[model samples]
Target chain A: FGIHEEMLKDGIRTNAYKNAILQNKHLFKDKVVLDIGCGTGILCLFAAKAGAKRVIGIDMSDIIDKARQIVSDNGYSHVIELIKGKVEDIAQLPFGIEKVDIIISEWMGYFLLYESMLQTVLSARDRWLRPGGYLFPDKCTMYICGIEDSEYKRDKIDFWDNVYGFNFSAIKADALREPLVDFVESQQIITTQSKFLEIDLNTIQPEDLKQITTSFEFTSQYQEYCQAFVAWFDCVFSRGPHKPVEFSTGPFTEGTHWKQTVFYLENDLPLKPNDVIKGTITISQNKSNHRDLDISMKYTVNGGAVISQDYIMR
Target chain B: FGIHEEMLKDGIRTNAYKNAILQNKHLFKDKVVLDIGCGTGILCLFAAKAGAKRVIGIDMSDIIDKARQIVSDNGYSHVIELIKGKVEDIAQLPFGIEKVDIIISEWMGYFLLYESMLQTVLSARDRWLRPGGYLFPDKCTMYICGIEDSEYKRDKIDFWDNVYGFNFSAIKADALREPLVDFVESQQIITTQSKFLEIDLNTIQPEDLKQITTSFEFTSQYQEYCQAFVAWFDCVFSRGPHKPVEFSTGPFTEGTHWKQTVFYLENDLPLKPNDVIKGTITISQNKSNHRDLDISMKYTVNGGAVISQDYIMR
Candidate 1:
């Protein structure tokens, strides 16, 4: 409740999320709903209001006292229940209850990947989902793209220029390369714009896989250029009779924005209107709960006088 | 007795100190004595055995139990007394203990001048010395000189050469200059070889002092050179009727022995005979509790090429 209250005051993405849930009323009606990592039980309240027959919210922390207070105050106590336990330890809950028909969670982090809370949701799906149980935001994908900016190039080149001009200053130049790589990898360039990779909750084979790749060409626009690329994603929250809710780049939905990572060359080479910089981006994930990216870029300067390459992984 | 027993087995400098006290019998006979920083009360035992009517030993730590045990074990508890307090806080001592005829302390640190325990002995001298009270190491002076050796110079140069050639090393040349200056100023480098500055602790007025400076000129015998120096001192325990014992640089008479402090020059400048390197060393003391050194050094290679300069207060 502490973080939930603070985040709400700070205008975190919960309202857009609430609107998406309300728009998908048909899925909640007469179905059993499970809310994983249910902080302050906000989603549980929404499901109960949407006419779910029973809603069970489980959180690893003891925010249930606040959850119970909110349910009692809203007079929805009979319709909703709160449990405090890990999603992996579902057996620690009541003995009679078994699988549920739907699972919901908000487990994404900065760049959609830093804190690995997705592992908990994935574990819950394996342990407690009924045969055809639905997963909200049923699938998600990260994307990358290139952008044109001269400011980035100037900053990079000036650092290298100083290293060459002053003998004593060269030591600082040697130390700067590694941190530049880290800064570039931290950005999120693009995402799967409104697509879902559906998995049958029970019958999905671990080895059945899919891959997506994309490339973009960009031109530098400034004399001293510095470029940064940003990314955002589209998420599908429901399917079937319910209207499918999409969260993506635009400001309409509660958007968890991801910024594109950037890589800088040691020196800035001049560019013309037609000069092209090619970017190759890759995204991969596994059943053991791992997600990462590998990117490489090749740049050709005007008149074919200069060419350079850079690579990063995160 | 524990320390004395350990010292006897190891045969440290304290054995020579005990002999010095015994041989100078006329200095302590029937005289009042003060022993500052008297660890384990060994010096007080010596004073009592040398026929001092009364001996008072002071230390900041509570070694009273050990002191009492040693005195009782030797059946000289009536002649020797151990007090636990700082010499600077002499006003709090018991009444009728106004002045003493002699003050002796072992207050040396690494390089013969560190740790600055000498300040405590100086404070006791200012607060409780009767006119002409003898200060052991009655007057002290520090000396500085230069040396050349291929083995020592190569070891020093190899460290920096590795930084520049094998490692992608950063601003290490600056580090060489700064730490060398610190080493020279922190050490007393010319005691037995040459008298630098002699300060008579009893009669020297604080306001009458000006900066004290000493210079050393030497030529290198090695291709990559590092300068090294050593220190020693002399003192008298008593005046009036007792002839002052002459304690010089030797294994006997508690002579000071300090490890040589080295300064590394890792640059490309070659040294030859008659290629003079001049070094200036200054030592001053802090006025607060410890009387720690406030040091500064400046070095020049050949006619006007500056080698290094540094200052440190410790």
Candidate 2:
């Protein structure tokens, strides 16, 4: 429940979707809209108030009951409908509805994939959307950059050096294999961000999400030690012939609840200005848990010895 | 595990126990020492190195294998023994041992009680320790003080005020019921600390831990809003004949991994200099989970309304 509040407080995130819906009134007006995984029915209300003929919100969690009340309290009950069940399990729309003209869903999770509900949203799109239907956030892009995070690295990684006069380096190794989620100051960026992956939500197949591998190169902006890699993503809401709305969850932008994903390096790399760092990042749904993600990073500094590190986000 | 590393890194915590063992060598020399929940066997090694005739370490976790290797690596395998089993479930001591002259355990948890292993240590003391045998770090005391944590309170609590133009005060109420574990800065202190409860481990019964209710009064040192109550504890390793080695895990002392427990107030109290705030804090084991704690705070500022708030540490 607190997570929902945190997400709602993310002005950049919620306001982007809000502006996307309200500004594109021509797309929603006199049309049927479906909101997948609607937690509190805010988006559904947005669509309803934007003149959608009918707004249907679906969520499998108990929070849907709260959303139902919220829709009613907002005086959109007559137009907005909420269902408490998974979209994949639902056979068809309620009230004899067959297809929707638009699908509005905020399905992105940490790093754009971990625990994301995009698969279910896509399934809903296939099952209930018309041939020319549109998705609110039809595009997403992920970016990565090297960071000089020596201060946090010392606290998080190097602190294991002497634990009460005992060497706990084994735990430090395990910690390095797990990515951390936190906010990185803008000045911590040691390299320009490189776009690593892009997702066209309307055209992406379920299989396309299984594994995403991309190569990236970053030139150090300053002479500093690169202690970790930081990642962030931007989302786009667009419909044909309509003005697109975009928001970024990155260090250079206003802080969002997602902050940034950080992957600490096992060995810090000292780089002169303009030094190049090239790497391949592979993001795959974990075999053990579909909701989790297995991330593999292979990189070299100035074409030095290749180093590989595996991480998991669960 | 990283948790073990964090505990071991708490110099004040580990060094206190180490000094207790090594400095009081007269009590450990030729004495049979028992270590409970000995993850990594650091304390057992301390006792062994302090000339204990025999040191037995027991832990149910798989870390005992590593401890076994650690003991052998330190070349004390002959004198120090590691066993993998819960102390309560063990029918008898290993190596034909029936009783121990000393019991050493590092069992304090967050807030000195949540998830503490003192119950198991006491059971071992009852079943295995010789009459008049000593328990290192036998006394504990918990203290509470008011803090002006406006910045963190804004991020952690007040941010719920307007979430995406929606009143998410519901989630804020729930968040207030969950006590936070973090480091509280010394500058945040707005009132003098009060000693609320004391535990004499040797004389206390298992039933005494079921519920701890104590009253505390603190005088505001400055004119500031009291946003939360921060608590810390101190442990004393003492026996009648030996000098006591003590360590304080308080905001005024060096930071430890335990940090401090924070209970945020739903409504901030405006306090003038020298204003008095009194409250009764009741801590009980959760009915659903033995490891979880249910905390209730009832307080009034300067004889104002008696406000009550409940919290849980799970």
Candidate 3:
């Protein structure tokens, strides 16, 4: 996919990202760099300015047309070589260099996996990385939490029940099956959460991403009506780094383009303090479309019968 | 093209079009309707629910796939026929009807002419419309006015002068060459203005759009340094035999998705309260690409020598 203008205007992601590369000049000194998903070639420019001898930027989208202009305009046409192709076919790329010292990219999409871009980055790593090279975001983690979501459920779901005096009830059922990607305030959470999973980019195999099945047991922190479960993630640049630099798109952190993903249950759960909600969530690439993912959830709230549903994030 | 979520949330466009259709049920009663550029078939639904016997929607975008699902989900599969093709190729549309009563499309883009979608609607009207058929938006107008803008120039245009300790000054030139698409405050106007041109859907010829050249004289209302000219447009559905409805995305009207397009001047001009800015603007389609337009301006103030430059909207 292509980059949206909204993501270009995101200050939190842009400013934090700028500091991450600009402040770590030693890491890039006298080394070669490779940038994946280079929307505007901004990361490649930073790598070149940080004393990287050579930088190869690649993207498999129409955005590379603009990135080419940006590279030339920024006077980086000499150091940054912009390529356009899929990383799985690296031999077809024009960059004849054997390997690179660093690989940088800003490829995370909504829910951190909608476009499955990380798989491409890993593919590039296996084919083009040196033994001791670095990955920009060396690690990442996903979390699942519950929230008191009465107002949103009414606005997004219930509003479809009777739209303008007409019965659009069928739309409500389909809307719940599609994840709503939007920002969520911190106080909306009403559950005690725990880590769901983490990926170490340096060691993760391609097979591990085919299906990410994780189970969770979240306890109610207060008496409230639970209407939805939200998922968010964090990216950390820690390996081979003096100090780790990371940013979160969680409810407690500053909002980003990849805000929390909300999945509303058909039946709301009424809970009290210390009530248990246990479930298994299996996230796998859609059988027909790799750009989309399928999520299956089976949960028993407060020790009741298990409820199951399927959701798609497209 | 794919639909951006930001454009989908534009209630200003959606609600106004909905009310215009829903309130005028008699216009669609027992009539055959055709919708151009129907992204998600919202307009077709309104026409169908308003008692139209049949509706045909056509669009050559990926969004039409989603529109097909929405048509089925809303139980209009029998009344609405969704065709995925350019309106210019209406011969193979399979509607097989000799003519249609009404043609409606929300085809406006940046600067009112970027991507030039209105051209196709005109072709459809000529080939399929009955003798007295109606167009959803009967008239559209474009305006050009001077605005007091310096802070924006620094943040949007000149920010590339020195980024991350690299001299990206060359980018400033290319950035200025491309028009900036964003909202401007209603109070940014610094000169008296008039309508540059208007398009009457029923009477306008396709060739008239090849080059829209107009001249104007504007006197400064206040002493200020003018560095840019902002342009916006308005649409009216006034040709009907009932009360007319109109909306504007202008400096004096509530903003819509079609925000004003800003053109920056390379050599800024300072003006007094009584000074004049006389100019001739010629807008023509790009010979190489019809989707874009080329704009050239020649202006002089206080009997000073005229300066000229060309701009492109890509």
Docking class of 3: incorrect
TM-score of chain B of 2: 0.96
Per-residue alpha-carbon lDDT of candidate 2 for residues B135-254, written as tens digits (9 for 90 to 100): 987899999999998898898887756555555454566668788889998989989999998888779899887788899898999988989999999999876228888999899999
For A117-161, candidate 3 gives per-residue lDDT tens digits of 788888888988899889987788888888988998997788655
Clash count per candidate: 25, 0, 0
DockQ sort, best first: 3, 2, 1
Candidate 2 lDDT by residue in tens digits, A38-137: 8767788788878999999888877886677667666787898988888767877888999999998888888888788888888988898899789988
Model 2's DockQ score: 0.18
Off by over 4 Å in 1: A1-314, B1-12, B149-193, B205-212, B217-257, B265-277, B284-294, B301-303, B311-314
User: Against the hidden reference, what TM-scores do the models get?
Assistant: 0.41, 0.81, 0.86
Better of 2 and 3 by DockQ: 3
Best by TM-score: 3
Kindly list the per-residue Cα lDDT of model 1 for residues B54-107, writing each as its tens digit. 888887765565566666666677888888877766665443778898786766
**True contacts preserved, each candidate?**
0.00, 0.00, 0.12
DockQ of each: 0.01, 0.18, 0.21
Candidate 2 chain B, poorest ten consecutive residues by summed lDDT: B162-171
Q: Which ranking of candidates, highest lDDT first?
A: 2, 3, 1
Q: List the residue pairs that clash in candidate 2.
A: none
Q: What's the true lDDT of residue B308 in model 1?
A: 53
Top model by DockQ, which number? 3
